[PDB]
């Protein structure tokens, strides 16, 4: 049926890399492809065929593993809240900045528009952190800014009449759910050269764009936990638009909410004793 045709999108990865045309020797004063001028800011236009004698090469290699979708389109850890047994409650602030691998991958772009698939793995363990048996339901509640936060395991906030929740078992399959692009802005921002507030220039609000922050995930067990639970929160970025590539992060990350780095030794690649030998 055509109605089911609406739920199917045929999508194709068949873009190839550029090929090579055979070329011959050139002795002239007409064509000088090797002479360049980096001052313009343009990258060199010279190609293989104009610099040496080439054979013909039919293109066969795909480019799809470096499409922005493929590069971001896998799951990565973004949150690891620990539910202790004293209160049986925990939360994770929602952003991709606690764990460095996804953050550094995002640092190649300025603005990014995407959806998210979240995946939550819960693991129970003892005080000495050895795996242990515990079968219990847990509740993950999305708490958006301005909604009252639960303060206990039995708080009546966990009613969840308006906050969305997911209920799953600690020893069941992983909870998984998708999320549309939720920013009030038309993209997310990986970096922000401004202040979070008018009438304020506190350093702690520099580089803080609050339209990236959609709130909190809160976690309880539905009864009081017998053992601590660790939730691992994975995000896969999908349906991805990217704008304005950047110099990628090179210094290690130090803080969650700013770009501070050490910068004690100004170098990235390793040293050698002489430029004319390895």
């Amino acid at each position: 049926g055509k109605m089911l045709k609406d739920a199917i999108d045929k999508q194709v990865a068949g873009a190839l890399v550029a090929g090579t045309t055979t070329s011959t020797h050139s002795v002239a004063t007409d064509s000088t492809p090797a002479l360049q001028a980096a001052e313009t800011g343009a990258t060199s236009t010279a190609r293989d065929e104009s610099m040496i004698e080439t054979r013909t090469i039919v293109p066969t290699h795909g480019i799809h593993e470096t499409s922005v979708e493929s590069f971001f389109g896998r799951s990565s850890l973004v949150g690891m809240p620990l539910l202790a047994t004293g209160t049986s409650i925990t939360h994770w602030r929602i952003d991709f900045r606690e764990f460095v691998q996804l953050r550094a991958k995002m640092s190649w772009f300025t603005y990014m528009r995407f959806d998210v698939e979240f995946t939550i793995i819960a693991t129970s363990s003892t005080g000495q952190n050895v795996t242990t048996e515990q079968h219990t339901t847990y509740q993950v509640m999305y708490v958006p800014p301005g909604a009252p936060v639960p303060s206990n395991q039995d708080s009546f906030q966990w009613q969840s009449g308006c906050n969305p929740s997911v209920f799953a078992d600690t020893d069941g399959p992983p909870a998984q759910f998708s999320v549309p692009f939720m920013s009030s802005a038309n993209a997310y921002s990986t970096v922000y050269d401004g202040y979070a507030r008018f009438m304020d220039t506190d350093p702690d609000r520099y580089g803080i764009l609050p339209s990236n922050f959609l709130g909190f995930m809160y976690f309880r067990t539905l009864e009081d936990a017998a053992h601590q639970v660790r939730f691992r929160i994975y995000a896969k970025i999908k349906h991805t638009s990217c704008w304005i590539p950047r110099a990628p992060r090179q210094a290690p990350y130090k803080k969650r909410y700013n770009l501070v780095f050490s910068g004690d030794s100004d170098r990235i690649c390793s040293n050698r004793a002489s430029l004319t030998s390895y």
Binding site: T201, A247, A251
Partner: protein, 240 residues
Amino acid sequence: YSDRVAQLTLGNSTITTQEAANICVAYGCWPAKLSDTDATSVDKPTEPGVSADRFYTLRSKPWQADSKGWYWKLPDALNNTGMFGQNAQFHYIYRGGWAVHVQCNATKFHQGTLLVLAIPEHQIATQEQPAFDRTMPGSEGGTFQEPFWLEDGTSLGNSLIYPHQWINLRTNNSATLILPYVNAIPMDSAIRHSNWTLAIIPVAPLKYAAETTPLVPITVTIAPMETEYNGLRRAIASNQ
């Protein structure tokens, strides 16, 4: 026939250079006004025209032997200047592009190379989160302390991904960049957010054919382009 000779006429103002390289147009995107499909603010914008879309010259900088570089936030650097500055002060939100022209002449008896970066959303840090006098330095601009890290934990070497030109003294005395508006929203406040940073970083140091080092200034000239303003109220000068 000659991309070494240029003339830039905006408003009542005209720049010339006899040693340009070319003109960099960032992302191949000439500045353009906001279309009805992307716009959100319902009030009718003020478009000041030539009163603001004109070249403004900042104070010059001496290129010294030890210079690490200089930077300016936009619109920050022009927020107190002319009718651009006044339109930016009197409105809540602003949008527009830039025409940037960096001047530095020296002799055929000099050597040295400047890198001229226009960096969008150039959030900066060092070993510490920066204060307001560095995030929004005004018309006088700021200076780099970690030019190798591009003040941001990235690297200067990879900043050629950003729109740029060089000033290599053997070749040219000026760099020109045309910048479109870049943001994740249609308009944004001029006092709270800097959409672009103009960064001028020495890569090859300045050397003279004698040991006596005359004064070689760097001079920045910036024209706003295709500007709109919405949200008229009293004039507010800074985010402090």
